Amino acid sequence: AERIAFIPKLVGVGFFTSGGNGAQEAGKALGIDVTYDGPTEPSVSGQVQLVNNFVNQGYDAIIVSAVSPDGLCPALKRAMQRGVKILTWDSDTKPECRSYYINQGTPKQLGSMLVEMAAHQVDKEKAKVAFFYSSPTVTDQNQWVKEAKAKISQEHPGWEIVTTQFGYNDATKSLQTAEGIIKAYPDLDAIIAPDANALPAAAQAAENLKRNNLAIVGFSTPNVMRPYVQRGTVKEFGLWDVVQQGKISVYVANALLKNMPMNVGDSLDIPGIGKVTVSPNSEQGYHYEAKGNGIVLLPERVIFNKDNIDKYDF
Template sequence: MHTSFKKTLALSLLGIALAAPAVAQDKPKVAFVPQLIGIPYFNAMEAGGKKAADELGVEFIYSGPVDTNPVDQLQIVQNLIDQGVNAVAVSVLDASAIAPVVEAAKAKGAKLFTSDSDAPDSGRAVYVAQATDEGLGATIIDELVKRVGEDAKIGIVSGEATASNLNAWIGFMQKQAKERYPKLTLLEPQFAGGTAQRAAQIAGDLMTANPDIKGIIAVASSTCPGVAQAIETAGKTGSVVGTGYCSPNTARAYLKSGSFGFSVLWDPAQLGYLTVWAGKQLIDGKTFEAENSVPGFAKPVTYNAETGVLLLGPPAVFTADNVDQFDF
């Protein structure tokens, strides 16, 4: 009886051991590779991705470069593909370099898609967009003109020069200025990479070289603190209006001090959630509809089959009056 029990137990344990890897393999893996780790914006996307993974039954992997280096980013993406991750989303740093990695993913049976920053000509499976590039570019110009006037001089401090999303927003800022505010002067964009310190230096130089400047736009979330601090350091709070694409938590102190008049963004946690949801749809072989019902979203998420863009929604404007209603 004792021997029989031991045999039964051994067989049971063997069965568990054999079954365990199969269960682990059955759980699809969705990864997101940000432009940069360790900043509030992408931290919020990570949190949204984790929430989606828990609710949708997938394993979520978050891995990205420690600085805005396109080569490092693409290596991380390639490593994830080589490890057998089923779907990999990337906030693209260099749109011109990602197409071969998309092909490598296809060869492995993986789905490579973009989120937050696109590479439209790369063959990516879908682009999970936070808002339309045109909407973001037009909104920040319209809101700034309300505060500085239609004939003001405005500086632009961006992040990495190769970031397709940042460049697209700048392009639509320029388009909006040209078409709606012909007297507005937009200075040539300056690029700070991913550091607030470099952004502060550039913003300070812009104010010194252009004493009549009325506004400065921080295009990357990582450049927002630098631009705001430069305005404060120069004693220009109130005479130079800072703004940018930054989260309420990043912008809160600057909105309240007056160095920032407003900021424009969306909810990056929702964007992270939508990214993982889209990855799961791709893994399951499901097609996106013109309107998609996503768990936890109040409104349907739209999809443009022609452009391959899944759209989170319109941009939001945060000010000193409403910033405390948000926490991300």
């Protein structure tokens, strides 16, 4: 009877497939029919069309990873006015446009990981670094990058951010851009790619142009990144239990459907996971707080290498 919609940025990417599977698995254990559906490409119109669709069908809850902070707001607010529980995972909208943000960590946390991974691989205070992710308008990544760039200028002033280009979650376009940066910048020391499509594309671009001495860190799935790690192209990268993330999003949504207290400070017990807690929106850097509105932070983030890459199954 209760239907929950789980919308990714796009389909075909291993990151969203894992999260969607963990969501449907969670819904099945709760007796909830979770419908996993997303556009073939990350666009505003793509998700809005779907959001409006699940609303008209009368879905009870919709969990969405936004491709734009304010792009989905008119459709999300329409849903809540009809009683549709709106939650966000991975990528957030505006805090007033949703209810809960199932976040994998604060921008300071994930922004620290990107810099720490880079500093450990470059091992010199004077170098040239380049950023390379999906889109300049996406929410989650731009929040990380801004905190990352701020952290770099404070902790590594000798580092020169020479460029910042995009791939738009396209495996083809990401490869072209990655090669272009590598060609145009022969003095490049490191590439920071906080994107599941950008990170393996950068590693591939390094191997295609046979460029060594190049630190390549970022955020992607161990499934895709595995060949590049074994060959030594990527010594270190990071992510999180995305399967668990999709699992939490459903459980939290279920707590809203069953009228449980989920204000800032309250907790919730999840089987096989433990204790999650509603953190304030200030953790993301937001100036917005409300009753029944907060951020659920993931318990643990993971650093991947050649030692523990076969440990996680998504």
